[PDB]
């Protein structure tokens, strides 16, 4: 880090160029690493199955146990292997009275990550190549666009964590000043609003069911890794948030939001509806990709003019993913043995506002365009080129000979 006296500079984090290469690099690494792992195309053929029965239980309604014909060894033996999936990777109709199919496989190739590879994010720094530099805004209340009254430069940005998340910025950074709300500057109605807290609130999560693992061999040197028997007392996954701190958090973000919109009402609301990729708060931890009904956490409504009473949210989990919402491609995630516990720091929200109505705003979560995740943390930075050559007058001169 080097701090610069008397420098005023323009940044435009909405148009800043190095988020494009952030997204392009982030997509490519999953693409590059995933390739050698074996594929699930042979299993996509349809299935026959029933209601599952957990140990010492007459029923599990949260489950479906599914029988499938699959090629084994190679092409000249094929067996009626069995496993169980979750309902979200399962659809039913067409063909016959008792048919069942995987959710994405018809439209897209499915791959499971190689089980030894870990999903967990790690800090990555980003450095300019030779002949360039990076600028910051040490300013602690920067809006995001316009000139910046205090600037420093650095070769490499601080470590950033490629956390996959919707509906909540978690395992991220914090603003040093008051809470900052950043939005498109053209019009009152905006594409997305980013609220970035100055104090983190803990989130814990767990999936108490003890999972055990079952394997099926498609390939000649590869294995599909399937989800098998269930063990333990059954519950859904769930997460825990401190209640009173959340009340103060929602009071504070409202208090800042009111400066923009000084009339009396703000209405927060649950998800906008639609498909699951937006309507549930999404993340991953341990080895599986959580989806949470956030609705209970954003039912509050305000008008103008501390380790107890814990709120809990039902949270429900999936194995096949439309990751980065890419056209026609999906990922599969293998199960992990036993229960998994989790902790993380919530840092902000990605919110969206509806078309205005009389004397009432309506704010709810939304957006979820994955570039907003990085735009919420890369707002400080920019990249610029050096031009090392310059010319001037003077009283000097060489000797001619």
């Amino acid at each position, epitope marked *: 880090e080097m701090v610069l006296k008397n420098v005023t500079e323009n940044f435009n984090m909405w148009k800043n160029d190095m988020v494009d290469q952030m997204h392009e690099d982030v997509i490519s690494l999953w693409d590059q690493s995933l390739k050698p792992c074996v594929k699930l195309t042979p299993l996509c053929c349809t299935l026959n199955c029933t209601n599952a029965t957990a140990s010492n239980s007459s029923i599990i309604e949260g489950m479906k146990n599914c029988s499938f014909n699959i090629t084994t060894e190679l092409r000249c033996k094929r067996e009626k292997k069995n496993a169980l999936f979750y*309902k*979200l990777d*399962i*659809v*039913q*109709l*067409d063909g016959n*009275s*008792s048919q069942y*199919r995987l*959710i994405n496989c018809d*439209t897209s190739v499915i791959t499971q990550v190689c089980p030894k590879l870990s999903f967990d994010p790690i800090p990555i720094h980003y450095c300019a190549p030779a002949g360039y530099a990076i600028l910051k805004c040490n300013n602690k209340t920067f809006t995001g666009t316009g000139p910046c009254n205090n600037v420093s430069t650095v070769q490499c940005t601080h470590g950033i964590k490629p956390v996959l998340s919707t509906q909540l910025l978690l395992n991220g950074s914090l603003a040093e000043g008051e809470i900052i709300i950043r939005s498109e500057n053209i019009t009152k109605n905006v594409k997305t609003i980013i609220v970035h807290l100055n104090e983190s609130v803990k989130i814990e999560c767990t999936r108490p069911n003890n999972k055990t693992r079952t394997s099926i061999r498609i390939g000649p040197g590869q294995a599909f890794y399937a989800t098998g028997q269930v063990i333990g007392d059954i519950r859904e996954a769930y997460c825990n948030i401190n209640e009173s701190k959340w009340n103060e958090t929602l009071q504070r973000v409202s208090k800042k939001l009111k400066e923009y919109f000084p009339h009396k009402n703000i209405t927060f609301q649950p*998800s*906008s*509806g*639609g*498909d*699951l*990729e*937006i*309507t*549930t708060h999404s993340f991953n931890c341990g080895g599986e990709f959580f*989806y949470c*009904n956030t609705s209970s956490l954003f039912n509050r409504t305000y008008m103008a003019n501390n380790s107890t009473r814990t709120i809990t949210i*039902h949270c*429900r989990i999936k194995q096949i993913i*439309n990751m980065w*919402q*890419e*056209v*026609g491609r999906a990922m599969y995630a293998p199960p992990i043995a036993g229960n998994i516990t989790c902790i993380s720091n919530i840092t902000g929200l990605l919110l*969206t506002r*509806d*078309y205005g109505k009389n004397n009432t705003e309506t704010f709810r979560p*939304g957006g*979820g365009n994955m570039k907003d995740n990085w735009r919420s943390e890369l707002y400080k930075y920019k990249v610029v080129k050096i031009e090392p050559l310059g010319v001037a007058p003077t009283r000097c001169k060489r000797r001619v000979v």
Partner: antibody
Amino acid sequence: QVQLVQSGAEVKKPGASVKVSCQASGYRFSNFVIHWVRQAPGQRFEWMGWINPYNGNKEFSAKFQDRVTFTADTSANTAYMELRSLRSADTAVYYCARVGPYSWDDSPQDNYYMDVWGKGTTVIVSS
Amino acid sequence: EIVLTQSPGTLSLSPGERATFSCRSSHSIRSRRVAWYQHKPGQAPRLVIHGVSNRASGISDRFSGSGSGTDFTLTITRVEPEDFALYYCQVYGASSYTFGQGTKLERK
């Protein structure tokens, strides 16, 4: 309230193409899949396909895939459809539609019933 | 592709009478992925039932439905003058969309 507003009525040439738009209000357009549906006079509705404005994923009835194309724009709050190689059988009323919200208790694609429609648009194939 | 057949083609009733409708199917819909809808000419059509039993938002309690296998039903506890319209059954989802012919509900 929820509403979908459509383009004006069309009378177009045989063998030419017909293009229709469907602009929405009352909700976030980028967050609900959209259907397209047709009805000839006195006949069934015939499903055409669906499009997801969030990601642009598509699925058509294979009967029409050579004939129909969709697209949508988040900044316009509008979905477009394109039907090529018109025939006299294409004379029909056309609709655009919305799905209901997915409760976390639901199973996949249970919400794909028609929650809301537009007022429809008349299309006639004539010289 | 699944084919549906509605009956009766027309039911004539004055206000205050009970109405019951039926929709057949060529294939057994074990999944309850069913829906019933309403249509008047000159107006955008309207949802009634989805998932066999879950009533649409804002619709009166007079409408209700039931069914299983390949025989699916709709009924009205008492008809009122606004309901005079066409009513339609559907199977939907997973590339299996299809519609019936329709049944006309009209004044006796």
